[PDB]
Design a protein around this ligand. Sequence first.
Ligand SMILES: CC(=O)N[C@H]1[C@@H](O[C@H]2[C@@H](O)[C@@H](CO)O[C@@H](O)[C@@H]2O[C@@H]2O[C@@H](C)[C@@H](O)[C@@H](O)[C@@H]2O)O[C@H](CO)[C@H](O)[C@@H]1O
Lengths: 315, 315
Amino acid sequence: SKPFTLPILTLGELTNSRFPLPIDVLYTNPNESAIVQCQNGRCTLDGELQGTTQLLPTGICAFRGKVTQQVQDEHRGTHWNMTVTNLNGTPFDPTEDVPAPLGTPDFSGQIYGVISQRNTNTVPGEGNLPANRAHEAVIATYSPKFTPKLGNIQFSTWETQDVSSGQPTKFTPVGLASVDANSHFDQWTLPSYSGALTLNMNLAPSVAPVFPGECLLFFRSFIPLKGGYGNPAIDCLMPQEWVQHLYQESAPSLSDVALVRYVNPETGRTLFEAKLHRNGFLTVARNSAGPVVAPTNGYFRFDSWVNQFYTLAPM
Amino acid sequence: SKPFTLPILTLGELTNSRFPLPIDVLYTNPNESAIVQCQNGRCTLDGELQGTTQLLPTGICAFRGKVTQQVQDEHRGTHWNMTVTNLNGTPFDPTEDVPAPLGTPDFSGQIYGVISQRNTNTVPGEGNLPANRAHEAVIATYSPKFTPKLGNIQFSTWETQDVSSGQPTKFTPVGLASVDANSHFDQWTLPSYSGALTLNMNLAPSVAPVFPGECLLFFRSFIPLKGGYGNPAIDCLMPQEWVQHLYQESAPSLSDVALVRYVNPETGRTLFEAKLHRNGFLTVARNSAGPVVAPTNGYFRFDSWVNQFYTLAPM
Ligand SMILES: CC(=O)N[C@H]1[C@@H](O[C@H]2[C@@H](O)[C@@H](CO)O[C@@H](O)[C@@H]2O[C@@H]2O[C@@H](C)[C@@H](O)[C@@H](O)[C@@H]2O)O[C@H](CO)[C@H](O)[C@@H]1O
């Protein structure tokens, strides 16, 4: 077969697969009460992308489409209805066996970013060039108007008027607007991709430890905020570079569980070991929550294929 | 000898190494009069990063640092000085043999994006959490105040007051503010990294065809605009995924030129051939400017190492 490998990129050379951020730390939270079932950063060890996962770092939490309607807020701000396409610009076919267009955000929150437009029509007197505009925007993924699987979403602006209808529109994500209670930030709560009364479909499966004393290991990034108090984070199961690597290699999985070692390349010693599961997630034997304190030169190296009964050395 | 390879990611699966954008099209411009000497997306075929190149898609045209104070400036908007560090947070050492902190923009223009801050100090009443803010911002890289090699740059905001002194600060690039004449957009004009009148140092070398009938081949992306007319583009020599791949493989270069073929896998046929040069750039035999019209599912396949005499089939 084709032997299994991971990239040799270090922690400071990896990026988050659920938001466009660098990886900051490795992280555990054994007492997590939520089901973990994120939809971006999902890839099996033999290279099958799942959920809404696509390969571009620029596509994570991105949208493309056109604005169709302006609707003022009751109190403050303006909302804009947007039809969405696939990120490559082709029409999104809701019968496609995916939860939503690839790259769609996979958590509840107010996602802050920039909406930009480049008009289709050009002006001969301007050298056959189009008009443009961009503004700060927020997409509330818990909104009843957040229906990307039906091909449409809503975003809000503080801008009151300068958003054009019928013109190509791009959303570049930047961070969150708020993590106040009213902003419903919960990184493990999936949006209702078709609206509140409708079941999500075609999901990548939930992940969990199955061996006693094990917990999930995450690649954690801190996410910027537009305002208010907080130090919010987004935890992914594998960095985007691992998704890209696994997709290209398509190495056969020889068992359900690979043993991997986090190594310090200077010393060559194993700092700790982890189980890398077939569905594309890590567990470790750790009985505590918080960051993993590790040498900056550390990375994961594949050791061998094991099974669910393998006992990891405690962290 | 570790065999040289390229990723099998397709054009719609690649991103630009000079700005955080997807690759839109392959592109030539044989009569370009400028010297081509970009500093991001620079990597030799045997995996040596050059210029200001680093590995993170999130690091391209990003800055990290601290705002010092608001500063006076004749130009429109409110202006702020910020110290800059390495992207990993360590102090930037100007004695390092690099032109500027890795990730620094490599072109003249008004770069539009978002400045965000997460305060160092936390508040007990807020659950021991820090205050945050973010605002749109512009960095004019041709400004005499743009001195990233000296550890200091300036940015402007529309916001008049809500940027805090002495707090951790991130710049997330989004596009350009303008491409009007007065905004000095020129993708091949390097910033003066240490200020007006100082010579840049430690640069990746210029690149050019050296064979009659040949021209540079670029991976082109269109860049968003905050306002104004235009359809500006940023051309890179190799996409970021190629930089990431070459860096990791570190395969010995067996000649100065790798012959590659652009293949349509669905049909299995070669669309055209190109030379991939040791310093990390492509040439083709083409006598016109403009996009290359071909499926976005096409990709470059390494064929063989060739010598200084090899003649490319015309596109
Ligand atoms: C949307 C807007 O106009 N923002 C300005 C406003 O921001 C503050 C309000 O949004 C407020 C509503 O209760 O929430 C605050 O969180 C927010 O301020 C932001 O967060 C606080 C904790 C501080 O870090 C502020 O610096 C930050 O902006 O009001 C502020 C000034 O208080 C600014 O004008 C915002 O532009």
